Design a protein around this ligand. Sequence first.
Ligand SMILES: [Ca+2]
Ligand SMILES: [Ca+2]
Ligand SMILES: [Ca+2]
Ligand SMILES: [Ca+2]
Ligand SMILES: [Ca+2]
Ligand SMILES: [Ca+2]
Lengths: 82, 85, 34, 394, 338, 145, 48, 48
Amino acid sequence: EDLDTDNDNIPDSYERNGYTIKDLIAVKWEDSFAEQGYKKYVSNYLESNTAGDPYTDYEKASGSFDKAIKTEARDPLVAAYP
Amino acid sequence: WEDEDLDTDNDNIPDSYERNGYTIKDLIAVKWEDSFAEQGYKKYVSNYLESNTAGDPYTDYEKASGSFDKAIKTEARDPLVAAYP
Amino acid sequence: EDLDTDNDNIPDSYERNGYTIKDLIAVKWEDSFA
Amino acid sequence: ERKEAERIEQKLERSEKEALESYKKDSVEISKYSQTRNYFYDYQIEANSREKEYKELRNAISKNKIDKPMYVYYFESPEKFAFNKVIRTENQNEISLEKFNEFKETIQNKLFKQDGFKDISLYEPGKGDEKPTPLLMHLKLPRNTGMLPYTNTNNVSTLIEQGYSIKIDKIVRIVIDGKHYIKAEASVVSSLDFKDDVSKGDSWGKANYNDWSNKLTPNELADVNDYMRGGYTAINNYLISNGPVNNPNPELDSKITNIENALKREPIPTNLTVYRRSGPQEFGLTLTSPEYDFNKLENIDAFKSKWEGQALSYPNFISTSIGSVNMSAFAKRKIVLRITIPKGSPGAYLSAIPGYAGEYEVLLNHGSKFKINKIDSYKDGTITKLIVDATLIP
Amino acid sequence: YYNTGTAPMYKVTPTTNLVLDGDTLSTIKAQENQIGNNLSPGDTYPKKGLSPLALNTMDQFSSRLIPINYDQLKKLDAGKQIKLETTQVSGNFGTKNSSGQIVTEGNSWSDYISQIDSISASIILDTENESYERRVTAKNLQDPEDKTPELTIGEAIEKAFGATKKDGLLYFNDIPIDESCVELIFDDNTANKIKDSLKTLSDKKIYNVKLERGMNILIKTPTYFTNFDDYNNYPSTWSNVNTTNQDGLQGSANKLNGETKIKIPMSELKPYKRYVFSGYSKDPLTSNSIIVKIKAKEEKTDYLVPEQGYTKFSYEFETTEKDSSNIEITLIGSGTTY
Amino acid sequence: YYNTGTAPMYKVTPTTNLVLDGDTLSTIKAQENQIGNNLSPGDTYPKKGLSPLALNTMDQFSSRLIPINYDQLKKLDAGKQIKLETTQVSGNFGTKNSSGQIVTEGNSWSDYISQIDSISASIILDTENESYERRVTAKNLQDPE
Amino acid sequence: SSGQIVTEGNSWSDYISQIDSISASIILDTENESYERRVTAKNLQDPE
Amino acid sequence: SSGQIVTEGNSWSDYISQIDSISASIILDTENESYERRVTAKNLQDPE
Ligand SMILES: [Ca+2]
Ligand SMILES: [Ca+2]
Ligand SMILES: [Ca+2]
Ligand SMILES: [Ca+2]
Ligand SMILES: [Ca+2]
Ligand SMILES: [Ca+2]
């Protein structure tokens, strides 16, 4: 549905089952997306900051953080950490 | 959606103008017509999902319209060139 | 008219053509004022 | 800007300090009282336990002003912009193209007025701010407006009182932290209004319309006075009965033409809002009609659904009361019409001339067209009365 | 200063130790003269092509020099060296505003360091001339209310280092980093967990073991590697190869009656460094042993007895010449092994 | 100090190294006595026609001179030179507050240096009179967004 | 706002470069007194 | 208006120049006491 318990602007089912970011909006994941360079993300639906870093799951997934952070730290499971 | 009033990054420039080309007159973004070149207007394009295309502290509208420090070079007024000392 | 683009309490036509300050409100310039 | 706030709070004496302290913990209820205050009788507006609070809060807000127009930003519910629906729910992210289309078409040319204390900010709503509604409006305050920022335990927020009507030019869709919002640009329209300034309203009327009769021949003044003294229930009924179509006659057409010429002779120099306590028979409703009973919520909802945004017209001679207080002669009427008169519009003050000319009576042209913007209600004892934000169209 | 993480650090203020023999001479926190404003991942302050900075003051206002005693001076001129250790680093991160207004003041990494370390596993990839360190969140099975997704070691490595999957095997940029093509180094706790999970596991591969908190995994890419399939990094050429079958871990046998010889010219090896020579050896049926000879500094002989499957031997040698003749390794022994 | 970019710098506070042969003698952050209030693109602090500024203090309050070793003094007296290397520069930019005044306090270029350098290409034009350095935003072809 | 005058936090260095960039310098040197002025000059290449 | 007096951050140097610019200085010198005063003077060049 449209439930969002941690209020990180990603639905609980999307986080549970997989999602990707396009046009700053979280959408469901589809197999045809992987051929176009998109990535599939899964994250904790009860925590706003899954990896414990100062950036939320949506902020990491969307890349709305510092442009100097590596691209591998854009998924919610790898922490942006110096 | 299909119209010319989308501002996804919220920087006072519509998405279509940023994708295709625009210019600033009277501090309002307008569509780029090729006749504007002979009058001295410069054609700008910028990222429509980022409010600061070049990464400098000034937004695309601030840079394009020249609503910033007057001591900055005119080359840095288009969004793709960074104002950077 | 009554257009103030830069929001500095002076209308655009006054700024273009010339103005003066009387009683802390801007008015049109007239050659008699000199 | 806590430095400016601490500079400006010291000049406040103890009364303003206590008013702001009471506001800080009870902003919602003080504001809710602030919207619906001036429509009660002349007695209730002086016998409440919060009237002093409203007066001193207004004094504090108007103590310090701004020298130039500056932009302010806040979140407004769509319900105040004549939209009775919900655009996008709290748990959803995106708004429909359709909903955007009706929302844009609903506010094409409609001016909405606010009359209560509210919280605004001078910055865009970035991180750390709460977002009540999916609607966002960037408001342009004019010169010399109330401006008294106050500080919380950690942050600073500003409070203003509104006495103006705001118009929105364009609306766009924006994305703030992964959710769709509507961004509106609006401007503040200057006017004059007397919520409770009986003395100031009387002074303004006598200042403007004392020299009104000096331009008129004595015969026309005598005719106007006689018509308003003896035949106010005759010519109005004749006009309502569609006289020119059914039974044309010159003996009353001459009166209509003379009164119309006199009323069109002198337009207002500044925008004002007049209050007419319209009768149910004017809207074609009778006291025994179930739709008339405004005690229930469904009748208010139905009246809003079928009459908000619709056109109105008065084939009779329009009589308006500049005062906003409930009068003995118009006590039982539930519908008060909030007509906004813009500059250059017909209307003459009839209380400047001597004698008892009525209750702040003002006459306008017959058959005038009216535009309804919003329909809202307030608690009045046990019953709920009705307010319509009428607009005068040329 | 250098950075091997995924995020930049602003206002880098490290605290260092100075150790002579068993004494900590002083611990100085960097003052304004020794603070680096920007440090991007993979970068270095001062930037490459600039001289190192000087750290010669110990007080708060950079007005007091670092003293030593008479005994310590005698130790220093006797030939003993002073070592440096870093104990902690203070720095800031930047939060981006909706208008893109970066602010770093008041945003300390030390507020998140402990929390990140508590719930994550550290994975290090140690390639040539460049290293990377990552933290991947792991699930806690003892807590039913922890809903972080489960990842194995292979998926964790793929997400942490941006690895690419070609045919089920991971590549970093163009280097294979599958568990059979690298050296996996664990500590005792991680080794115990891996061994206790492999016996329960079915497919019996390290990369299929579920990632758990506190794991310390270090991956080292080889200097030279051959799979006889598509990758050959050796500078010289093996004496005799065999690649006419789909055997081995992937389509490669390299075994006949003859014995394999390789001679590394030693011009492409480190002067004084200690190495390991690994591989996989299989025999379909029980057979004789393998005579593995290594000759780098002293010729070491070891006997290898393979099995039905594949096993790693990882025979170990030492080079301390930088000028001597080639390095000789041989795997004498036949009998149709793999 | 000289500027070759597109934007001015306020409160210019550079950091420099002093190297004799292979030894970094000291690194000094500019104190109050060595801070340039303004530095326009193409300008120089001090302005053209004025003498250079003296950098002779190493502590925070400009009360401690820069010392050298006896051996380093012997190296200097033999003819060896001391080179200066600028490692980093601090500075501010100007925005507009709520009232419309230009403010530079709280605005720092170091916040944006990494972000600008990560997503841009560096081009330098070298003429006889002066050289110009520019940063132009480049697109990452691996990101569909 | 109250008619007071504040000088803390108002720095001329924030305006020196902007003033020097868009203006021309004119100096009048009479006996025992000198005057220096900056007058704004239009940029012809910018239609705005 | 409640009787509180604050002197911190209220500097006379912000007003010294403005006062001296539009005033005329008058001094009375009596025996063993002196007074200095400033009186506002009209500028006839300015019609406003
Ligand atoms: Ca969620
Ligand atoms: Ca989450
Ligand atoms: Ca835009
Ligand atoms: Ca943009
Ligand atoms: Ca203007
Ligand atoms: Ca193979």
